């Protein structure tokens, strides 16, 4: 096993941040890490990304990170640190954007990024079994469970349905596009 530098740094950062929220409280951390919520904040460019790092319960961070380790970890080892970095930044900003759009700047978590990873590992598997990357049958099922729980608000997973589809779309676009090049 052992998980690559992008996979690892991101887990650490989500933990460190979650601790900061436990210590200072949520709003205090949000105040610093959330999508710009006043015009005077629009040029603080980390906030278009760092909403991805804040989680609001033990379950949210636990499941986000399990998925991230398993999928982000697979993507990194098989297909490179750069691929994982690019899926993450695009899916982070686009789901950030749609969330923001429909329901305001108060939100957080890696749930958008995880949906992009699920769609990406799945569609790559189907279109190019040859690259080393597929979502196992069993796991497809547990991905679906995790998705359904989110979609029907069975576990409060910070982001709306509109933002997770944005995440998914990015994973599919990029899988789509990668399976064209091979």
UniProtKB/Swiss-Prot annotation:
Residues 25-51, 100-101, 156-159 are periplasmic. Its EC number is 3.4.21.105. It is an enzyme of class 3 (hydrolase). It comes from Escherichia coli (strain K12). It is a multi-pass membrane protein. The chain crosses the membrane at residues 4-24, 52-72, 79-99, 102-122, 133-155, 160-182. GO terms for biological process: proteolysis. One of its GO terms (cellular component) is plasma membrane. It is found in: Cell inner membrane. The loop between transmembrane domains 5 and 6 is flexible and may readily open to the extracellular side to allow water entry into the active site cavity. Residues 73-78, 123-132 are cytoplasmic. Belongs to the peptidase S54 family. GO terms for molecular function: endopeptidase activity; identical protein binding; serine-type endopeptidase activity. The active site is at residues 111, 164. Keywords: Cell inner membrane, Cell membrane, Hydrolase, Membrane, Protease, Serine protease, Transmembrane, Transmembrane helix. The chain holds residues 91 to 272 of 276 of the full protein. Rhomboid-type serine protease that catalyzes intramembrane proteolysis. This is Rhomboid protease GlpG. It catalyses: Cleaves type-1 transmembrane domains using a catalytic dyad composed of serine and histidine that are contributed by different transmembrane domains.
